[PDB]
Design a protein around this ligand. Structure first.
Ligand SMILES: [Zn+2]
Ligand SMILES: [Zn+2]
Ligand SMILES: [Zn+2]
Ligand SMILES: [Zn+2]
Lengths: 81, 74
DNA sequence: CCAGAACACCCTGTTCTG
DNA sequence: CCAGAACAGGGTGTTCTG
């Protein structure tokens, strides 16, 4: 019953190594598999929350990285301990 | 040959009273009618240019109004 | 030439499947 | 539980129509 660490929406589980909602889970996967040459229109600190997370993919992706999301998370936990 | 005064894309003609591109023309009309209440994720001063105009409809719509865009101007 | 409508795509987020 | 795929919708921008 926790909150997505990236956007504070209703979290759905531990995804790519972090507590997140589903939207952030698929957003991160899409961002890492393509290019993430996104551009912030503000000052690289946009507020990423449930209604505003769509505004700035640049800052959203940055928060994903900063919370520790990574593709090999599940496979890394499966080497422990 | 010219420049949209809202997003700086190549403008297409005078729309709603102002030199704008086509995307800004239709954005503005949708903003006034659909009257969604948009919310900035920054500080209400986002850069509105070709690639970023889509990031912040609140600020884009503000820049539209500030450039003089107006529905009943014809 | 411009307003408005239609179309066509992208991005997103929910649901399905392995 | 959680990854990845599929599917459904909203916003955006170009083209079409009045
Ligand atoms: Zn989230
Ligand atoms: Zn940002
Ligand atoms: Zn424009
Ligand atoms: Zn803004």
């Amino acid at each position: 019953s926790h909150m997505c660490l990236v956007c504070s929406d209703e979290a759905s589980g531990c995804h790519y190594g972090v507590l997140t909602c589903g939207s952030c889970k698929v957003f991160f996967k899409r961002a890492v598999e393509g290019q993430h040459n996104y551009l912030c229109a503000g000052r690289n600190d946009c507020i990423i929350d449930k209604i505003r997370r769509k505004n700035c993919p640049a800052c959203r992706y940055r928060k994903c990285l900063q919370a520790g999301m990574n593709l090999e998370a599940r496979k890394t936990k499966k080497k422990i301990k």
